[PDB]
């Protein structure tokens, strides 16, 4: 049972939960790969395990109703080759995957999640309206609310429900007469697919991409989003009057539409989850990463900083002010957003919660520590154990 | 063989070097323990030494030669006769450079070949040990133009206890448990400070009192030695545009000299082999001064900056820490004392990884230690995947001798 220390306070815990880890991770006694991003009837083992989880949680181990539900899934797989999840189970499992996500720093919220069950979905113009309910629900005029919509569980012999975009809101990226990119370069490829499938490209740098939505075996179909449903925030700085002129914006709803929810051995390749943003996500990664918007040197010129020597820390000053603008902009617009201090402190709280409840917590240190000011947040000084619990969110190959 | 991607650029390389990982670390396929700070007969001494000698002869382009098999048999015949063996001087110099090269948590490894090696394996007493240490500090400090150096004291051997430097670094500031329940000085150093007093040191009571050395000779209690003040070069901390900053009274010392780690070379063990380089600004400005469990000046600076410390979203912590780092860089540059910032350091470490891939087919690296503790993703190492593993020769942790 791994010994885990917090170096700010000196306290020690033991991760007894780590013993359950199923899908073995990427590391070996020989080498550590913790820093790498992307490192028939077995279906009943994973469903038995999940159902046993559900009842224990509602204090219902070893009972009539516990006995009972094990048999129906036994018979369901026997006849048809899979099974259907009871409504409450799909809800319980959606929350558990979130609770189990090692790279999510906001899991103190894991118990408050709105589950839209789209399992009876049947087409692309159908898909679009489920997605469109979710978005408008979760956005809620800026008072953001966590939601996951769950589309049909994949089956053999038939195609797949998949969202071809990484997120529900994504900006375009276009090459040029010199190869380089206007717009967001994280989405250069999916932009090229959309322009291919009929979409008329804009000139702008913040063109909200049309959803490529795909129903089983039928090809994708472009689905222009209602611009009044895409809540956005123009970026301004509280005291740097010129920051607004830079013309920067980001969207309100972070909604991940390419991961594959897995409950009880069942795989839902379309299950968009959404919450709200941590400011460093926008202001540090999205805007300042060299391979993303790469605005850092432009804000430093406008601040009349000395970009000629790295020891002026001009990169660090400009970055802090870009983050201030994000928090200021979002707060002015009344869109739910949380700073990396408030958020990491709440995750520390979560770890103590999960300590008493489940005896530990899988956390990925490299993803919990924020990309600025890491050692100024408490999680920096917290040792962490990383492992895989089910149910979970998993990565999946792109549908091409 | 692990595929390793650079997310900033799109580069892809495979780490074949990891295949030869000598010892084992704490992770398994069940679970990663990478973020843990402390993750821990003649025949096996033989195959270790055999491996190092094979290394040494490869570096001098003599692999498979007369001299190469001569040394092998020499070493075997000596472990047979004595249960151990002695390194040649040139083997020792190569061994200490490799250990630097192999150290997964050092971001400064671009320099690994520029290392001055003081052979002190003839040392006899704590007193001779003290003299060797002062000569080390003197040469490395070099009046502010710092030089990388290591001093190697006698190896562990059957029949005799170890040499040990009880201090974790050659220059450390006292930490006195206080009136309330607080610490005056550096709270990382209360234990060693208690030990020095318990061994006859007359305590000071400032915040930056330099500690005496406790030097341990084989089968002897530690002996207290005071460092001559004129030999510990310090830097008063001032801010280039914030003139009230000098009234904080903060200082730091020039020479980072780690003194409690163990140098391992072809199976031989050197529990006393202190080494020194020059500081990266974040060690002082972020960690040593802003850590809540260290000098913890972050809120005091922020108030002085007239930042609004009542809400986190104003990013007062971020802004105050950036200025503390600025002050460190400026103070060391004003005082003409070598220093590298996390941007310069991480960029040069990226060249090191490129040198190492061509030379050895990879590089062992502890991501969470290489990425700076401020402005992480602003530096290029954040966006670089890394493989962490243990190669020998090596610097290892060892327990406190008390
Ligand atoms: C409500 C507030 C939430 C906040 C502030 C938050 C914050 C974050 C952040 C900062 C990341 C790192 C992502 C990156 O840097 O690429 C992350 C990852 C993740 N989050 Fe959350 N999250 C929230 C809610 C949720 C919800 C509702 C779910 C699912 C139902 C979720 C599941 C995940 C997963 C699976 C990842 C891993 C993403 C990946 O591997 O690319 N989180 N979260
Ligand atoms: C010349 C300039 C050098 C720079 C800028 C540098 C940089 C660094 C930094 C910033 C750390 C992390 C320290 C911490 O966060 O506690 C580190 C760790 C380390 N360095 Fe270097 N270094 C230098 C020279 C050297 C030399 C000369 C050696 C040995 C011969 C060495 C061996 C090590 C070791 C063993 C560690 C890990 C120590 C530990 O695990 O506590 N470095 N280095
Ligand atoms: C190479 C490195 O593992 C990679 O850049 C990771 C590090 N930590 C991260 N953490 C978060 N939250 N998001 C990321 O994209 C990354 N990138
Ligand atoms: C628990 C966590 O691993 C610990 O705080 C580490 C993180 N990374 C670090 N990185 C460096 N360079 N030095 C440190 O002391 C630490 N501490
Ligand atoms: C590249 N990351 C995509 C968006 C990540 C994310 C997802 C969620 C659900 C919340 C959040 N705060 N952040
Ligand atoms: C806990 N380590 C404290 C000193 C670390 C260190 C050591 C060396 C040799 C150089 C450096 N720049 N930093
Ligand atoms: Cl994003
Ligand atoms: Cl230090
Ligand atoms: Gd101007
Ligand atoms: Gd001033
Ligand atoms: Gd004061
Ligand atoms: Zn690992």
Swiss-Prot record, chain B:
Platelets, placenta, liver and kidney. L-arginine binds at residues 169, 278-279, 283, 288. Zn(2+) binds at residues 27, 32. It is found in: Cell membrane; Membrane, Caveola; Cytoplasm, Cytoskeleton; Golgi apparatus. Heme b binds at residues 106, 397. Changing residue 396 to C: Found in a colorectal cancer sample; somatic mutation. Coiled coil: none annotated. It comes from the Eukaryota. Residues 31-402 are annotated as: Interaction with NOSIP. (6R)-L-erythro-5,6,7,8-tetrahydrobiopterin binds at residues 35, 287, 368-369, 382. Produces nitric oxide (NO) which is implicated in vascular smooth muscle relaxation through a cGMP-mediated signal transduction pathway. NO mediates vascular endothelial growth factor (VEGF)-induced angiogenesis in coronary vessels and promotes blood clotting through the activation of platelets. Homodimer. Interacts with NOSIP and NOSTRIN. Interacts with HSP90AB1. Forms a complex with ASL, ASS1 and SLC7A1; the complex regulates cell-autonomous L-arginine synthesis and citrulline recycling while channeling extracellular L-arginine to nitric oxide synthesis pathway. Belongs to the NOS family. This is Nitric oxide synthase 3. The gene is NOS3.
